[PDB]
C-alpha cells in the first residue's frame, strides 16, 4: 500500500566536517490532481472492485488500519538500517544519529500525569451527545 510518485530537486550542501561541497538531491511533497474532463473517464473505467463502504465503514479502514500498516513499515526500515552499522557499513553521519535522538526525545510524555484528568473530561463530553 502506498503512493506511486516521488519528487526531487537538486541543491548544493555545505558541510561542518570540512568535506568539500556536495551536489545532492532534496525532497519535495507531491500529490495526484484531477480535471473534470478526465475523471469522467477514470470513473467510467473503474469497474473493477468494491469501494465506498459508506461513512463510518470507510473511516476506520482508511485512517486507522492503512495508517498503522505504513507506520510499521517505516519502523522496520529504520530497524534494518541500524544493523548495517554492525561493521557492515560506516556510520554515514553523526547527522542521522542526531536526528534519531530527536525522535526518541520528542515523543509524547508518559501518559501518567494530570493529563489523564484532561482526557476524561473530553471523553465524557464526547459521549454524552452520542
Amino acid at each position: 500500500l502506498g503512493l506511486p510518485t516521488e519528487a526531487y530537486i537538486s541543491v548544493e550542501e555545505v558541510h561542518d566536517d570540512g568535506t568539500p561541497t556536495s551536489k545532492t538531491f532534496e525532497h519535495v511533497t507531491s500529490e495526484i490532481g484531477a480535471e473534470e474532463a478526465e475523471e469522467v473517464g477514470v470513473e467510467h473505467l473503474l469497474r473493477d472492485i468494491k469501494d465506498t463502504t459508506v461513512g463510518t465503514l470507510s473511516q476506520r479502514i482508511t485512517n486507522q488500519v492503512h495508517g498503522l500498516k505504513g507506520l510499521n513499515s517505516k519502523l522496520l526500515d529504520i530497524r534494518s538500517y541500524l544493523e548495517k552499522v554492525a561493521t557492515g557499513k560506516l556510520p554515514i553521519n553523526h547527522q542521522i544519529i542526531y536526528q534519531l535522538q530527536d525522535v526518541f526525545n520528542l515523543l509524547p510524555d508518559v501518559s501518567l500525569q494530570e493529563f489523564v484528568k484532561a482526557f476524561y473530561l473530553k471523553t465524557n463530553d464526547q459521549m454524552v451527545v452520542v
Binding site: 461513512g55 463510518t56 465503514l57 476506520r60 501518559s111 501518567l112 500525569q113 494530570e114 489523564v116 484528568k117 482526557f119 471523553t123 452520542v130
Partner: protein, 50 residues
C-alpha cells in the same frame, strides 16, 4: 495476645491500622484498551443490516 495476633505494631506506643487503601492511580491504559473494544462494538451494530 491480641497485639501479636492481629496487627497494630505498638512501637512508639502507637496502635495503627491501615485504613487508607487508596491504590487506583492514573491508569488511562486499561481504559485505552477496553473503551476501544466498546466503541468498536457501538459502530459494529449501528450500520450492519438488522
Amino acid at each position: 495476645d491480641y497485639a501479636k495476633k492481629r496487627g497494630w505494631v505498638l512501637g512508639p506506643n502507637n496502635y495503627y491500622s491501615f485504613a487508607s487503601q487508596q491504590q487506583k492511580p492514573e491508569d488511562t491504559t486499561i481504559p485505552s484498551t477496553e473503551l476501544a473494544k466498546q466503541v468498536i462494538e457501538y459502530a459494529r451494530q449501528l450500520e450492519m443490516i438488522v
